[PDB]
Design a protein around this ligand. Structure first.
Ligand code: FAD
Ligand code: FAD
Ligand code: CL
Ligand code: CL
Ligand code: CL
Lengths: 261, 259
């Protein structure tokens, strides 16, 4: 068989919302298939969003507290706040991590961004590895999360056409790049194509049934779907330390698309 | 003599950001401008938008982030912290958002200012939806006539944000903010001020940051805005909201939204 360990990070303030419905569907679907599921329901946990000096469990390491170096010490010395530590343990436990949220101002809800900011410590999600001739940190297809898969599940009010290649909001995959490339591929996840639902504010029973069918199909194929083929940083595709794509790859092109093989 | 609102997100007053914030405030005041500040961490800003913000029971069967904002804003029941920020915004001619880049985006506390202040009736959901207009947004809206600018500190190098740099081009990474959050409700958006390699800033580097910052501040009403395209004034097909085919012909992606 092979029972997978799935962690769902979920950001919506109302349990009877569309998002709440889809969350409950996904959790039941995965449990019925034989997988184990842990959930971080950020609003239910009253998750603290603003990273600050109370998270480091120690006085400042230098003359004044620094978001970076104070994390580096807290993580290395074992003083981080206990909420942080429990999330980090969930991530280490999981084989697959799913982030589920409504699109709010073209980005994660604040409370979810605060999960990123606080959980992704120095020594854990960044700051790991050497800086040398041909290696510039353990990131972008390397890091703590190598071997794990991640996927977003996003609901949006705008129409699909509004997120099309010439659509005014920007192409969906480019708007999601800071998340999928910067937050998921960065600490070493294999990132699956996102599941994005459009025109969600008017969802009725028939649209919901369509959403559920699409969701179940993604959840059934989590370990078969091909990841987004983002380029690794440290294995020849980029010049180091400029971290620019070598001239023979995607020649004469620039922008977000050059980072896909 | 201009009215400038600074929205500022950093937890430590002695930080590099705190030093830049103080410099900017003093520089603007010495020039004769009036400055209001929203120091989010100092105010203990609530970041998570929820039902406690709408000041009333749910308008329908269960609270909805959209419709309960529409009603709170229309009926005057939003939480007082929100109202006070909306008042600042209406007061200001120029709004500056100052933050360290954290995970290629604003700190959560600032994202939560956006999520909670930008109400239905204020920043979105205003106006006609038809075949000729699709909401008062993207170069139209409540903020038309105001200017906005980002001031961003990043740890990564400039080259890492270059057009072929691994983190993505800086202006593409900042698109959801500049186009999605600032141009959307009607600001003219000035080019961002972005400082790189900030974790190693020394006296010399700080002097260079200060000089760049002063220069931007001295030109806030002279600098040309980012030439983003208005949604409703002919560049786009409505309601598909796709750029009309003779403009940037054959091209696609974020760059087609600038003329
Ligand atoms: C602050 C904010 C910013 C936003 N920014 C953007 C943006 O940048 N881009 C964008 O495209 N959109 C944006 N939106 C819209 C947003 O993405 C949608 O409102 C959100 O995705 C809807 O999901 P929800 O869970 O909140 O839906 P809810 O409002 O809870 O519900 C939506 C509909 O689904 C129905 N529903 C619930 N459960 C069921 C069921 N079981 N069967 C059938 N129907 C069901 C509901 O009755 C309701 O009609 C924004 C909204 C807010 C509040
Ligand atoms: C959670 C997190 C996520 C991050 N993600 C990203 C990312 O996605 N992209 C990226 O590029 N970067 C990233 N960074 C790096 C971040 O952008 C930088 O740490 C930040 O810009 C530094 O600004 P600060 O105010 O926190 O600096 P501080 O840490 O306060 O100070 C930085 C340096 O400036 C010096 N300094 C302060 N005042 C002065 C002065 N008056 N004169 C001379 N020197 C001065 C300090 O001594 C210190 O060396 C991340 C950092 C964190 C904590
Ligand atoms: Cl790193
Ligand atoms: Cl709108
Ligand atoms: Cl045309």
């Amino acid at each position: 068989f092979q029972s997978m360990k799935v962690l769902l990070i979920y950001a919506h303030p109302e349990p009877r919302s569309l998002n709440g419905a889809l969350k409950n569907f996904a959790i039941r679907h995965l449990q019925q298939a034989g997988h184990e599921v842990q959930v971080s329901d950020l609003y239910a946990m009253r998750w603290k969003a603003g990273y600050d000096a109370d998270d480091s469990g120690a006085p400042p390491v230098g003359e004044f507290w620094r978001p970076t170096l104070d994390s580096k010490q807290a993580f290395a010395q074992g003083t981080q706040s206990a909420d942080i530590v429990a999330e980090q343990e969930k991530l280490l436990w999981a084989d697959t991590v799913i982030f589920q949220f409504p699109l709010w101002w073209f980005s994660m809800p604040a409370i979810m961004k605060g999960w990123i900011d606080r959980v992704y410590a120095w020594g854990f999600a960044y700051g790991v590895g050497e800086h040398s001739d041909r290696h510039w940190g353990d990131r972008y297809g390397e890091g703590t999360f190598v071997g794990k898969r991640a996927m977003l599940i996003v609901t949006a009010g705008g129409w699909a056409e509004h997120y099309s290649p010439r659509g005014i909001n920007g192409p969906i995959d480019d708007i999601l790049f800071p998340i999928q490339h910067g937050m998921l591929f960065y600490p070493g996840f294999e990132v699956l194509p996102p599941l994005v639902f459009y025109r969600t504010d008017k969802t009725d029973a028939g649209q919901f049934a369509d959403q559920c069918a699409a969701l179940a199909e993604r959840l059934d194929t989590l370990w078969q779907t091909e990841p987004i083929p983002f380029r690794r940083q440290n294995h020849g595709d980029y010049l180091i330390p400029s971290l620019t794509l070598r001239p023979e790859l995607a020649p004469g092109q620039s922008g977000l698309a050059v980072h896909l093989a």
